Design a protein around this ligand. Structure first.
Ligand code: MN
Ligand code: MN
Ligand code: MN
Ligand code: MN
Ligand code: MN
Ligand code: MN
Ligand code: MN
Ligand code: MN
Ligand code: MN
Ligand code: MN
Ligand code: MN
Ligand code: MN
Ligand code: MN
Ligand code: MN
Ligand code: NA
Ligand code: NA
Ligand code: NA
Lengths: 185, 185, 185, 185, 185, 185
């Protein structure tokens, strides 16, 4: 059976629905209210081969912060539920993903203990309309509800879009590795 | 057949017995006379899926140095014997293992040529009763008798226990990769 | 209607049992297997007016790390259970506690989002047999399971025992304020 | 069917013939007119398990530059042709290869967009008769005709031969990974 | 006609008995109450070919300082008595002893004038339970009662046990050379 | 009962045959395919009074590296065989050899534990056709197969030929002292 986690949460500020299939085929279905975040969540599907369904509405007239945060929290919760007892999985994941001049390494452990190590140098404040401070907050919130150990280290990159997209590719491939089953155990 | 190496050696200072199964199931059986080293040798089993049997007695009333050294030498010798002609194996191993804020990369080659590259920053002198200088000596001695190329690089970490434990996890997973058989060749 | 939380957790490394009364009278009953942590948990009772009961055994022959962590994890969970729906409480707590030359400020929010801001300068590595790296790990683990926002800032201090004890007094008094009921709410 | 690419090109300066089998068994057949480059192309076969056939003649009486360049261009073209529509492959490759004191990480993406990130510190100007400036030009030209994203980062090394050879091992193993088929998709 | 010196001194703090044979065969019988010093005194015997017998009890419940000092004072006196009129001996001794990464040079003159030039950089405070400040005090006390000119210079070394042990190997070999007879004289 | 070691090793890269007599008369018979290494191996014979016989062919059309390494590896193994059980030997050797403006100290121990401490500053890249990076590789490979502790320290020198030759003279004289018998043992 496919490991599926879902979370729905409605607050005064946001309305969030997420479903994730750890054993998916790369189905991307992301409409967070934040177009650049949808593009990044798409990478999680096509590079991690997860099925990622995110539908969010929120107070984006204020800014994208609350939506960005609640989507990440909900994804963390869904990821945690889909993992179940976590028996038999690789648990650790590693990947360095280039995107042209950008190169980001992600190392993670599905440990049950939240920690974010974040070392990105994003040189512009907006990619499209997306506030680039929200990248760090996305991953911080995600590790907080999933209980993940997550390290993101930038080795190269000047274009903010490239840097952020490379981060999500490496994250997706590291998370795919960590969630996959260890054939020897 | 399982690739098993054993070494027994008795000196004036130490009495060392080691057995390693490269094709194990993660059986940990470590009583080196150094409780913190036993914990680290346990990681070698649970994360490398080796079967690791270490029984040592020694002149720990002086300090843990001679025991620490002779255990490492013996493990290196057992690892070398279990490897045999080394035909068909991956030979190289790579892994970055986080432990909370700690992150250590290990890259190794079962080359037949000993070399230790060691770049850890352990900020305290004792973890429990374990002298933290012995970590470097453990790996130096191990590479010396096994003929291993070994690189240990710390990217992150403040807690000495975390740093050392992350080193052993990454080592175990890199060594597992290097000792496993390459299915294409 | 006293707010009581309890947590038992047994692992291969530790056996931990904790009970905390947010509306206590300062009853301390702490036997963690780490005498200096017991002294600090006693401070939590007498300065926060909590009833704190901690009974733990663990692999202290390796070092104090696993016990220290699992005790803090359990206290964090017990604290979360005792808080219930969190209706009517002050939620925020603030206190600056001097201890002779030491002065530590604690600012915290029972927010549901874990974060530790930690800025202590403990100039020695051992207080008694207690590894001073474990202080930061204690609060980090506690915030992780309680979902607390916690900021610890040293304004003064040279004696390690003083710095750490001032931290626990300030934490105890800040948490007391936060868990107390807002009379206007 | 095996993914085979071939390129032949004759200019006033050079006569180049290359054939590559992405699904090979490690057959090395390299006679570029540059003995040290042949040794490096051999690594591509034995460590990448490609079948690599290179036969070049050229104006080496001037220097090795034109031959070095045209061999790399031709390899890039052959690699591109063998890849075809690139459906189903891993596409990304990662490897850190030690050679004694040397350690080089290679991260690559078969993206269709050429880019070389090159960070090697080769401390001598000649390895044998091979001008060490040609290493960078080899990879630059190769990425140019294959459309590859390629990052080469030196973490360690003092012997120029070791550094260069470690680069080619890591490249071969990263390229093997990138060209291999993803079993899940 | 073997040169044997012997000192016995009982104080409120320690009870010390030492016997040294300059023309010995390496018989070690050292029980100073300080295990690490015993290990070092054993090196004095096997590397200098002295017969070294040290028996001591002392207020080690305070620390090892008084025992360490009084043992060193007693050996120096015994060494002085064994040397007699010092006629015919080499008088000067020189040796550089490696111990793995450590390298210590000892140059000495059995001059009748005490002087210690001491240039060791011991990076940890305890080897086992042995306070590494006691190394300098040992040699300072020994030169004071023997009337020796002694220079100890560290050229290399990171492991504290190695540095100290290389120091005693080089001292023993330099002292052996200095106490041996000059055949032309 | 002369102590003689021999080693033949044939690889696809090199064909190496070495014979060494620890109790020789300085007979040199060196044809390694590297004329400058031959000159240095002649120094080993005349200054150490070893009989040194080296016959090698190899892929010197690539560069001198593989030949240089395999010759040193073989000499190290032959040296180890000739040493036998190592009973009665001095084991340690020390020598400072001037050559005009050059001055190099060699300190070594036939310990069974490989370590190279290497501190030479060779200011040119080629002595004749000999790549000066290969000097360090020669001694590193030799210590690895002989199990020698070896420290090489340049105190003076500007001419590369002088620096390297002084190194071989000091090494030859130090190894002679170490392999000679301790008359008192
Ligand atoms: Mn807000
Ligand atoms: Mn926020
Ligand atoms: Mn994009
Ligand atoms: Mn040692
Ligand atoms: Mn642990
Ligand atoms: Mn921990
Ligand atoms: Mn107190
Ligand atoms: Mn040109
Ligand atoms: Mn060009
Ligand atoms: Mn090579
Ligand atoms: Mn004193
Ligand atoms: Mn020792
Ligand atoms: Mn080499
Ligand atoms: Mn010459
Ligand atoms: Na979308
Ligand atoms: Na155990
Ligand atoms: Na060839």
């Amino acid at each position: 059976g496919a490991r599926i986690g879902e979370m729905k949460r409605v607050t005064k500020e946001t309305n969030v629905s997420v479903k994730i299939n750890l054993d998916g085929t790369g189905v991307a279905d992301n409409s967070s209210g934040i177009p650049f975040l949808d593009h990044m969540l798409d990478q999680l599907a096509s590079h991690g081969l997860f099925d990622v369904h995110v539908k969010a509405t929120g107070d984006t007239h204020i800014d994208d912060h609350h939506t960005n945060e609640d989507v990440a929290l909900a994804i963390g919760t869904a990821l945690l539920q889909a993992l179940g007892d976590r028996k038999g999985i690789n648990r650790f994941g590693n990947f360095s993903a280039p995107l042209d001049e950008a190169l980001v390494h992600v190392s993670l452990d599905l440990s049950g203990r939240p920690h974010l190590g974040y070392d990105l140098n994003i040189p512009t404040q907006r990619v499209g309309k997306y506030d680039t401070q929200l990248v760090e907050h996305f991953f911080q919130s995600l590790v907080n509800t999933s209980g993940m150990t997550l390290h993101i280290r930038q080795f190269s990159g000047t274009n903010s879009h490239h840097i952020i997209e490379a981060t999500f590719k490496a994250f997706a491939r590291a998370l795919r590795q960590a969630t996959e089953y260890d054939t020897r155990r």
